[PDB]
Amino acid sequence: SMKVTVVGCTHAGTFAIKQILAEHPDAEVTVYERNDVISFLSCGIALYLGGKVADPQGLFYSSPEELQKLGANVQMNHNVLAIDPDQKTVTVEDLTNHAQTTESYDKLVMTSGSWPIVPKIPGIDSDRVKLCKNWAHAQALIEDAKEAKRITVIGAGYIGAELAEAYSTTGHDVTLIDAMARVMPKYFDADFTDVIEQDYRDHGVQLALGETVESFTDSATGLTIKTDKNSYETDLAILCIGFRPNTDLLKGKVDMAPNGAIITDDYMRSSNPDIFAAGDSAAVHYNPTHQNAYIPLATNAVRQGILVGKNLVKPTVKYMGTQSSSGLALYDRTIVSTGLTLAAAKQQGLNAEQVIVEDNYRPEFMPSTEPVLMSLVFDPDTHRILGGALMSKYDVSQSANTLSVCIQNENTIDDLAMVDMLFQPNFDRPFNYLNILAQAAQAKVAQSVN
Amino acid sequence: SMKVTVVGCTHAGTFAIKQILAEHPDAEVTVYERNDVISFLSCGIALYLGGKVADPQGLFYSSPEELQKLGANVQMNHNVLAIDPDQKTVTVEDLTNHAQTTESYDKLVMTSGSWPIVPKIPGIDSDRVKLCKNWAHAQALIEDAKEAKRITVIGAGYIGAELAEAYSTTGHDVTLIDAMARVMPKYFDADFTDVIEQDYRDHGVQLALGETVESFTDSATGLTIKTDKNSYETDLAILCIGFRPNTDLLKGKVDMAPNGAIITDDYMRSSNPDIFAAGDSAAVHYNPTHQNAYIPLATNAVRQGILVGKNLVKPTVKYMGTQSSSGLALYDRTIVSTGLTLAAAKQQGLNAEQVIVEDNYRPEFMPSTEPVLMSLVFDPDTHRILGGALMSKYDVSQSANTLSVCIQNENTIDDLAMVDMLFQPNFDRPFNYLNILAQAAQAKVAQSVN
Numbered sequence: 033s034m035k036v037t038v039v040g041c042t043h044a045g046t047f048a049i050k051q052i053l054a055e056h057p058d059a060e061v062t063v064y065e066r067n068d069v070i071s072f073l074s075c076g077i078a079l080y081l082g083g084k085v086a087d088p089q090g091l092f093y094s095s096p097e098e099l100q101k102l103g104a105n106v107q108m109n110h111n112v113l114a115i116d117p118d119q120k121t122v123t124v125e126d127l128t129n130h131a132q133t134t135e136s137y138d139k140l141v142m143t144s145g146s147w148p149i150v151p152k153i154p155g156i157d158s159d160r161v162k163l164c165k166n167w168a169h170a171q172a173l174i175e176d177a178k179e180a181k182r183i184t185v186i187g188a189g190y191i192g193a194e195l196a197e198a199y200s201t202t203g204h205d206v207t208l209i210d211a212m213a214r215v216m217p218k219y220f221d222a223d224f225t226d227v228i229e230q231d232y233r234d235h236g237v238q239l240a241l242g243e244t245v246e247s248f249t250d251s252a253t254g255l256t257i258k259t260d261k262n263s264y265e266t267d268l269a270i271l272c273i274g275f276r277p278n279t280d281l282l283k284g285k286v287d288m289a290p291n292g293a294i295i296t297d298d299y300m301r302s303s304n305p306d307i308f309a310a311g312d313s314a315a316v317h318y319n320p321t322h323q324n325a326y327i328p329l330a331t332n333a334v335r336q337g338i339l340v341g342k343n344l345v346k347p348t349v350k351y352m353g354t355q356s357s358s359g360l361a362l363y364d365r366t367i368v369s370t371g372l373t374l375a376a377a378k379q380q381g382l383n384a385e386q387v388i389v390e391d392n393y394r395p396e397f398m399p400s401t402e403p404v405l406m407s408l409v410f411d412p413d414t415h416r417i418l419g420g421a422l423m424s425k426y427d428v429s430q431s432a433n434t435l436s437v438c439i440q441n442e443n444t445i446d447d448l449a450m451v452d453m454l455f456q457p458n459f460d461r462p463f464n465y466l467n468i469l470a471q472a473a474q475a476k477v478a479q480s481v482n
Numbered sequence: 483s484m485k486v487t488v489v490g491c492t493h494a495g496t497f498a499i500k501q502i503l504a505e506h507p508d509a510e511v512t513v514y515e516r517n518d519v520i521s522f523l524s525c526g527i528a529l530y531l532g533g534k535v536a537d538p539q540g541l542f543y544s545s546p547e548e549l550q551k552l553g554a555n556v557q558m559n560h561n562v563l564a565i566d567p568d569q570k571t572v573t574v575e576d577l578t579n580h581a582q583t584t585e586s587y588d589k590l591v592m593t594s595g596s597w598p599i600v601p602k603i604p605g606i607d608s609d610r611v612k613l614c615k616n617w618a619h620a621q622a623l624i625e626d627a628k629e630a631k632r633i634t635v636i637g638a639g640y641i642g643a644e645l646a647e648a649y650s651t652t653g654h655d656v657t658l659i660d661a662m663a664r665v666m667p668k669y670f671d672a673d674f675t676d677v678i679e680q681d682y683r684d685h686g687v688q689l690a691l692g693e694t695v696e697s698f699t700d701s702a703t704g705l706t707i708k709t710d711k712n713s714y715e716t717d718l719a720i721l722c723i724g725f726r727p728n729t730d731l732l733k734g735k736v737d738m739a740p741n742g743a744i745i746t747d748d749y750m751r752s753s754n755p756d757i758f759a760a761g762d763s764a765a766v767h768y769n770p771t772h773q774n775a776y777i778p779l780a781t782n783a784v785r786q787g788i789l790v791g792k793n794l795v796k797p798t799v800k801y802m803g804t805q806s807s808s809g810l811a812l813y814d815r816t817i818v819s820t821g822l823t824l825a826a827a828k829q830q831g832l833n834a835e836q837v838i839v840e841d842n843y844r845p846e847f848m849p850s851t852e853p854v855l856m857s858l859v860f861d862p863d864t865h866r867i868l869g870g871a872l873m874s875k876y877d878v879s880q881s882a883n884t885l886s887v888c889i890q891n892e893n894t895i896d897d898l899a900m901v902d903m904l905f906q907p908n909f910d911r912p913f914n915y916l917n918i919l920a921q922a923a924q925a926k927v928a929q930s931v932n
């Protein structure tokens with residue numbers, strides 16, 4: 033029977049194994065995972081530290097026992113040491129006793145995920161510097177936070193943004209450091225990040241943007257972080273400066289993006305047709321640019337993992353690409369986005385323009401309403417929508433998914449300006465705020481012809 | 483100068499006039515309207531009677547003074563008595579002094595809307611039987627509600643359902659009478675309306691479904707309503723049994739649906755190329771069936787009004803059709819839908835199947851979560867989505883707009899099962915509930931092929 037080896041099992045491996053067992057019940061599925069746990073939702077780390085999680089056992093949706101019950105050979109606490117594609121073998125180490133074995137496979141599923149970026153900064157190995165990815169990192173931060181009054185987050189991505197907000201609302205002195213000029217520049221344009229950065233300042237968070245960390249120096253009174261512009265002392269530092277594909281097992285053996293992300297076809301097959309990749313270990317087709325990108329999100333992991341099971345024997349279901357749709361909740365604001373920002377679109381030489389619209393999402397005669405700040409990025413010549421974002425105290429998260437479907441179908445600002453959307457004052461004005469947003473883009477395009 | 487006559491001005495006429503004046507500033511636009519007010523939002527009637535509207539003056543978004551300021555010859559309190567499309571002339575009556583005039587036009591915009599259906603039932607002319615459409619009807623119900631403990635709603639569509647809910651939550655004894663079997667069967671299937679009808683019973687509303695009103699008889703202690711199965715005494719009866727296109731001015735002169743709705747091309751031109759129709763006076767292109775239908779919603783009126791302005795001279799912007807996307811709030815429940823129900827699809831002999839899913843909309847480890855009941859109607863052959871509905875105490879209204887864009891682009895259950903949507907525990911599971919909905923539809927299709 034067909035032998036399948038799965039390297040790594042958090043989200044992409046979990047969905048791949050379940051899919052393979054469901055559609056090929058005769059296949060021999062062996063899975064190796066360094067940790068003793070699977071299906072951990074890292075998105076809940078900041079939610080717990082922020083107080084919002086009572087039972088940490090709810091942060092798991094699967095288990096090694098469940099995959100075993102489904103018919104999988106589950107080998108937890110195993111570290112894959114080598115992958116031999118020409119001999120189609122794999123060498124694995126049992127971390128409980130160093131026992132090494134060499135096994136054959138017919139298909140290999142590379143779901144080894146990613147690992148945080150740790151730069152060559154002097155003193156970064158300090159015990160007051162912590163990572164924040166897996167369940168082990170979470171349990172450490174859970175116990176270490178009660179004593180760390182001063183928290184410093186290094187890296188102003190969405191993960192770093194969530195940690196700073198979660199620690200600020202729980203009685204900590206928070207400093208947010210990043211070398212980039214703005215917070216979360218991949219998701220939102222300057223109009224959005226200006227409001228968010230003001231929210232951090234209003235809540236006492238010290239913003240140290242545009243500064244590069246140079247050294248970590250430990251003393252009795254805490255950890256001293258020196259940047260090219262200032263110096264800070266903290267009780268704990270957390271690294272949130274991005275992720276790197278954990279694919280060195282296949283380096284030089286399958287085609288890769290410069291950062292190590294495995295390049296796949298539309299059926300999740302690598303350059304080696306017997307090695308599949310899914311999740312943080314792989315690149316994704318970015319629909320707005322029709323090129324590969326590294327977008328390490330759980331949405332890609334669960335989707336690509338399913339496709340691995342669909343296409344294990346032969347191509348069956350094509351990958352639909354992604355728009356990198358994301359959403360965040362910070363200081364009672366819902367901040368969502370999808371596709372390209374204006375900055376990213378121009379940074380990549382695309383013909384793009386932007387409209388910014390602020391409106392109450394539902395009529396004022398209602399008992400309450402709330403302003404929603406909206407952005408729409410579009411090609412001024414083809415009118416094709418390239419991206420969009422919404423920010424409001426009202427939960428506007430589902431509108432980003434509406435925009436994602438628009439971009440998936442390559443709809444224009446003219447499609448969105450008039451497409452049928454419901455009206456009821458409990459929810460919106462006669463035209464939905466997404467219609468109003470696209471009508472503003474039309475007016476900006478019209479203001480150009482005349 | 484091009485002379486334009488607009489017959490009727492609530493929503494479709496308001497948007498048409500503003501659009502015509504903006505894109506043809508040198509048009510002579512003359513508008514006649516029986517009422518002395520424009521742009522009244524009839525959806526606010528039930529919202530006020532439910533205590534959700536402090537100032538009823540805010541239920542307007544434009545005014546005759548505004549249209550005149552924009553350049554239009556605004557003739558309020560005028561009743562158009564005749565239209566001659568051959569000679570391109572109109573005959574109007576000034577309702578303030580009975581004065582009649584006769585004017586010519588180059589183009590005529592027929593935005594005469596609709597009027598409630600009044601059946602030939604004995605006693606229905608009683609002063610205790612009230613209509614519920616325009617601002618004059620609203621003021622009467624606002625003043626009568628104080629003296630009407632017992633309210634009887636006739637017609638269990640969305641309008642009557644909202645009135646019954648509004649009165650019942652404000653201390654009124656409510657009876658909901660209708661001859662059809664379910665409430666709002668044009669929007670929702672039985673799984674949804676069973677829960678809705680149960681909410682009415684839990685809140686003390688007397689559901690008189692499957693009953694046919696036979697007479698209204700005034701008595702000493704109010705109004706006696708006799709049906710074929712029961713007898714009711716009430717203080718106020720409100721007719722909510724549907725709407726008829728108010729188009730008798732053009733009967734036999736332009737092509738019409740059997741109910742009188744004016745049939746237009748994709749540019750809102752009637753069979754007479756110089757007469758446009760928009761709003762409740764017209765039939766709409768229904769995308770799920772690709773046929774003309776009568777769907778009197780404010781969403782269609784504001785859209786088709788805009789298209790009249792853009793297509794006044796020559797065809798410029800095509801009509802995108804509609805999905806009849808709608809949404810309501812009944813007893814803290816957000817209930818939204820778009821496209822075909824399974825009942826309506828089978829009633830028209832369409833190859834259609836349905837899947838029903840109930841799930842918590844976001845993970846259980848969050849501080850709170852809420853169940854959402856979901857429906858997806860699809861063609862089991864082509865996999866094309868025909869319609870969908872969602873119901874939850876959490877505001878899921880935006881998801882119906884996502885399904886509308888899906889139907890607009892003729893996406894399949896396979897497209898929706900895997901299309902990129904954001905994940906963050908504040909909003910959804912790793913797969914958005916819309917993804918999960920379409921994945922269950924794939925499962926139903928899969929269990930039939932094997």
Ligand SMILES: Cc1cc2nc3c(=O)[nH]c(=O)nc-3n(C[C@H](O)[C@H](O)[C@H](O)COP(=O)(O)OP(=O)(O)OC[C@H]3O[C@@H](n4cnc5c(N)ncnc54)[C@H](O)[C@@H]3O)c2cc1C
Nearest residue numbers: 040042043044066074075112144145146311312328329330
């Ligand atoms: C704090 C945090 C918050 C996040 N929030 C969100 C969010 O809100 N929304 C969203 O969409 N995404 C979010 N993400 C990203 C999301 O968690 C990742 O995309 C997801 O973990 C990727 O799934 P994966 O299984 O492909 O990768 P991984 O989770 O990294 O799984 C890889 C596994 O492979 C194992 N492994 C690696 N090498 C070997 C080897 N030689 N032998 C054996 N095992 C090996 C590793 O032990 C690891 O467990 C967040 C991430 C973090 C860190």
Ligand SMILES: Cc1cc2nc3c(=O)[nH]c(=O)nc-3n(C[C@H](O)[C@H](O)[C@H](O)COP(=O)(O)OP(=O)(O)OC[C@H]3O[C@@H](n4cnc5c(N)ncnc54)[C@H](O)[C@@H]3O)c2cc1C
Nearest residue numbers: 490492493494516524525562594595596761762779780783
């Ligand atoms: C209680 C109620 C609640 C509703 N709730 C919603 C909702 O929540 N969401 C939604 O999308 N839709 C809703 N609707 C429907 C929506 O209000 C209508 O579709 C909308 O009014 C249609 O706009 P219209 O201008 O085309 O038609 P109309 O509102 O009927 O306007 C027609 C105008 O033309 C005038 N007129 C007619 N004949 C003549 C004549 N010979 N001479 C001069 N003037 C004339 C009339 O006086 C009238 O003012 C609701 C309707 C009602 C009645």
